[PDB]
Amino acid sequence: SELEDLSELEDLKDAKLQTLKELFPQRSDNDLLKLIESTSTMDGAIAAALLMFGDAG
Amino acid sequence: LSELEDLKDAKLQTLKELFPQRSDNDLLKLIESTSTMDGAIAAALLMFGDAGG
Amino acid sequence: LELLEHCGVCRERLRPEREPRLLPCLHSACSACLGPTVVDCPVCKQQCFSKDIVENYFMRDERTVYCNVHKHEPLVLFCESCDTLTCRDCQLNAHKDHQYQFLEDAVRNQRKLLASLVKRLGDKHATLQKSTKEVRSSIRQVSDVQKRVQVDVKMAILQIMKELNKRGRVLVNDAQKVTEGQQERLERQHWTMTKIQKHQEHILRFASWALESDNNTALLLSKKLIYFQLHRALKMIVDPVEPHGEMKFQWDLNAWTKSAEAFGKI
Amino acid sequence: LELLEHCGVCRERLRPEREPRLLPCLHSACSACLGPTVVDCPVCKQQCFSKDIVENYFMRDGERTVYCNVHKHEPLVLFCESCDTLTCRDCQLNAHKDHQYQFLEDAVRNQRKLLASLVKRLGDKHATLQKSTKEVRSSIRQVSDVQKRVQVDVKMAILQIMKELNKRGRVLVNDAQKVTEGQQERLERQHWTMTKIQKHQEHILRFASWALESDNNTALLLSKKLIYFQLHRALKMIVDPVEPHGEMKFQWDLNAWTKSAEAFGKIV
Ligand SMILES: [Zn+2]
Ligand SMILES: [Zn+2]
Ligand SMILES: [Zn+2]
Ligand SMILES: [Zn+2]
Ligand SMILES: [Zn+2]
Ligand SMILES: [Zn+2]
Ligand SMILES: [Zn+2]
Ligand SMILES: [Zn+2]
Numbered sequence: 001s002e003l004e005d006l007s008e009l010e011d012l013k014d015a016k017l018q019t020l021k022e023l024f025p026q027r028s029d030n031d032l033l034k035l036i037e038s039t040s041t042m043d044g045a046i047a048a049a050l051l052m053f054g055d056a057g
Numbered sequence: 058l059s060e061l062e063d064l065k066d067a068k069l070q071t072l073k074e075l076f077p078q079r080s081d082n083d084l085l086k087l088i089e090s091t092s093t094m095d096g097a098i099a100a101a102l103l104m105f106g107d108a109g110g
Numbered sequence: 111l112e113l114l115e116h117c118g119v120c121r122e123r124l125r126p127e128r129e130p131r132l133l134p135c136l137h138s139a140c141s142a143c144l145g146p147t148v149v150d151c152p153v154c155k156q157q158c159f160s161k162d163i164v165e166n167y168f169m170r171d172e173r174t175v176y177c178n179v180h181k182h183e184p185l186v187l188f189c190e191s192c193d194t195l196t197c198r199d200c201q202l203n204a205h206k207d208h209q210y211q212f213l214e215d216a217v218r219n220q221r222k223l224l225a226s227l228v229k230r231l232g233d234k235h236a237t238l239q240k241s242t243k244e245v246r247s248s249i250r251q252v253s254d255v256q257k258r259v260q261v262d263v264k265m266a267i268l269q270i271m272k273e274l275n276k277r278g279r280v281l282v283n284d285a286q287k288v289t290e291g292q293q294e295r296l297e298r299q300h301w302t303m304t305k306i307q308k309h310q311e312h313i314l315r316f317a318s319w320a321l322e323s324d325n326n327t328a329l330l331l332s333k334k335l336i337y338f339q340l341h342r343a344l345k346m347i348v349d350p351v352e353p354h355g356e357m358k359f360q361w362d363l364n365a366w367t368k369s370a371e372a373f374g375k376i
Numbered sequence: 377l378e379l380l381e382h383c384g385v386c387r388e389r390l391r392p393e394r395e396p397r398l399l400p401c402l403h404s405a406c407s408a409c410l411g412p413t414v415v416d417c418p419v420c421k422q423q424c425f426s427k428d429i430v431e432n433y434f435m436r437d438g439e440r441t442v443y444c445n446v447h448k449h450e451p452l453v454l455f456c457e458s459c460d461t462l463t464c465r466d467c468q469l470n471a472h473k474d475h476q477y478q479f480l481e482d483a484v485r486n487q488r489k490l491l492a493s494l495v496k497r498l499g500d501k502h503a504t505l506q507k508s509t510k511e512v513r514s515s516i517r518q519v520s521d522v523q524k525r526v527q528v529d530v531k532m533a534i535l536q537i538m539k540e541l542n543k544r545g546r547v548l549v550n551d552a553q554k555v556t557e558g559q560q561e562r563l564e565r566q567h568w569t570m571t572k573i574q575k576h577q578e579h580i581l582r583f584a585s586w587a588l589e590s591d592n593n594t595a596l597l598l599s600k601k602l603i604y605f606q607l608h609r610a611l612k613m614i615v616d617p618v619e620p621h622g623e624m625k626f627q628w629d630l631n632a633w634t635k636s637a638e639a640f641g642k643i644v
Contacts, residue, residue, distance in 0.1 A: 015347035022309045022344060023302075025401075025421030043350050044295070047302045067614035074576040074611060075569075077135075077155030095617055099569055110572070114586055132601070136583050136608055153579075164600060173593035195599065217595055220602065221588075227609065228584055235577055241619065242570060249560075249567065252622065256556045259626040263549055266632060271538070274641040278534060281644075285530065289523040296519060300512045307509050314502055316402055319380050321495060328484050329440055330433050332455070332462060334398070335487065337430075341402055342494060345502075352508050354515075357522060363530050364644040367537060373640050374541040376631075 016041055024050055024057075068093060072102060079106050118143030118152050130166040134158040138166045188216045285359070292355060299352075306350060313345050384409035384418050392435035400424040404432045455483045552629065563622050570617070577612045 013036065020032040032050075039046045065088060072084045084102075091098045102108075115124055118139025124130060128140035135154035143152065149163060150156035167175060176184045177197040185195040191208035201210065317338065324331070381390055384405030390396060394406035401420040409418070415429060416422035433442060443451045444464040452462040457478040468477065584605065587598060 011347070015349040018344050018347065019306070019349045021421075021423070022348070023305060025423060026416075044299055044302060044353075048298055063614075067616045070611045070614070071573070071616050073155060073157070074615075075572050077151075077157065096565055096569065099565060110568075111582070111586070114582060134604055134607070136580060136604065167597045167600065169597075173596075175596050213595070217599075220599075224588070224602070224605075227606070228588070231584075231609065231612070232581075235581060238570075238574055238577065242574065245567060245570060245619065249564075252560060252563070255624060255626050256553070256560070259556070259630065260549070260553065262630050263545075263552075266630060266634070267542075267545055270634065270637045270641075273638055277638070277641050278644075282527075282530060285527055289527065293516075293519065293523065296512075296516050300516055303505075303509055303512055307505055310502055310505065313402065314498070315377075316380055317495070318499075319377065321491065324488065326440065328480070329442055330435075332480070332484065332487070333433050333442075334430070335491070336460065337398075337400060337402065338491070339494070340400075342498065345498060352512065357519075359523075359526055363526065363533070365533055366644060367533070369640075370537045370644070371540060371544075373636075374544055 013041060016043065016046060019043075020046065020050065023047065024054060027054060065089075065093060068095065068098060072098065075099065076102055076106060114138070124166075124168045124170060126167075126169040126172065130168070131163055132166040134162055138168070141165075186213060188213055190216070285362075288359065295355070302350065303352075306348065310345055310348065313341055317341075380404075390432070390434045390436065392439065396432040396434070398430050398432040400428060404434070407431075453480060454478075455480055457483070556626065559622070566617075566619070573615055573617065577615070580608050580612050 016036050017029065017032055020036065021029070035049050035053075036046055039049055068088050069081065069084055072079075072088065073081070079102075087101050088098055091101055113121075116122060117124070117128070117130060118137070120140070120143065122128065122140070124138075125140070128142060130138060130140040132138045133149075133151050133154070134157045135151045137151050137153055139152060144150075147159070148156045149158075149160045174184055176182055177200070180197055180199040183197040183199050185197045187196055187198065187201055188194075188211045189196045189201060189205045189208060190211040191205060195213075196205060201208070320331070382388060383390070383394065383396065384403070386406075386409065388394060388406070390404075391406070394408060396404055396406045398404045399415070399417050399420075400423045401417050403417055403419055405418065410416075413425070414422045415424075415426045441451045443449055444467065447464050447466040450464040450466050452464045454463055454465060454468055455461070455478045456463045456468060456472045456475055458475040459472065462480075463472055468475070587601075587605070591598075
């Protein structure tokens, strides 16, 4: 059961990564990942951090 | 006691100075009723009788 | 001055023929000013019966007045045993070998004693004339004390209001900061939703057109099912669910009005 | 609609001669719009190397035929089920020898019927977002109106507290005012006394002064009234008033307890 929950968690992280790609796409994936881990994967706090380092559009 | 008599008569003459029309026997009863305070006597004088300058 | 010389109600000049009389209260008026038992003053009281009323003798510019009894024999002499004056006949009659004196010496002595009386009484009426202004200023001073307390109270009130509005608007700035931080979050979230909806709407619009053209296009279409379904996995788990920040700032206004009135009464 | 058929920078109609390529982000543009390692999108990003960039095949209305990658003029018509894509007859004999296999006609029907299911599901999902957009848009207006209204509620409650407090203070002020003017009217009798006494003394005094100053054949007129001059001089000699002093306690009747005021104002 714990392995099933882990394989779910993986997709849960990847989906938020895909949203980041839809939003600000030009920054590398290896860059977005360190931040979605930093944020502990909050759907809006991730986006706020994305606005933080990078630029302002 | 001959001092207290002049002490009373002084205030009596002062009342005659203030309101003179009122008789003397009348003013005596009031200077006794007040126990001879300088101003409370003038107050009780405004009380009964004319009370205007 | 202008009022002493004149009479009572008529204010006529001192006419000696007017037989003017002088009251125990020292006013002077002709017996043609007031006629009627005990006689009273135009200013003071009926301070005495008519029996103690002397006619005013003021005959300006008849220097002489003659004795009561011995008719035309004038008084000049001073009966030292009777405090008053007599003519030569009474000092041979009534005051025979009564100890005797002349006018000059007793007049000088009486003037010198009355002048002393007058001087000391003037020095005392001067204390009156000064204590009058003293109490007159004390009255304005007490009235000013009332007014100055009236202002002191209001200014203590207003200083209390000042520091209170400081300590109240400092707490109001908390409502400012919160409301605008929650609104910063709401702006962020609406912005995210709008930009993501537009990316999804572009993806959806293009895919929808590309599919709806399915007449004689199966050749062109079948070449791209891979990347179609790839961006469909992109828009499939797009991963945003609307949270809602509940309103509990309604339960943050400290409205204890009863405590306020209780402390403001005293 | 008007935007898909057209190209990238030039917005040319889909010219098959234009060699239009299709990027991973699904936009389309001719290789004459963007030439340059990893190639990026005019809208999105460099989502993929140029290696994963296929050319757009949209030659509308006689190229219903598209020809295979390897076997030259042998066109792709067949679908390799084991490779998710298409091949011509030859690839299915060589590369896809006995590889699980499907024909276009059945695979196209089934694939259209499955992609339409995916599309209907994603459309019914995106409707909920086209609704939640307006949802949050109105939530902003409601949150801002409620923020302004709570911001005004606090202020108006404070103002009402202040109104009633000022009433209840000004009341005690008027009370002290009534007390003070009562006390002054009571102490006022002393000026009354002083004035009337001064008048009697001034009458007598006027008289005395004139009486002495006239001395020409007035020893007679004067000598008669020494007794009554000294009698009303006994009247004005013992006049009998002593000035009292009303102590000032109006300085110690202001309730200056400010330390309590600040304490009760801190919390609210
Ligand atoms: Zn007259
Ligand atoms: Zn009089
Ligand atoms: Zn004699
Ligand atoms: Zn004689
Ligand atoms: Zn172009
Ligand atoms: Zn793009
Ligand atoms: Zn195959
Ligand atoms: Zn082939």
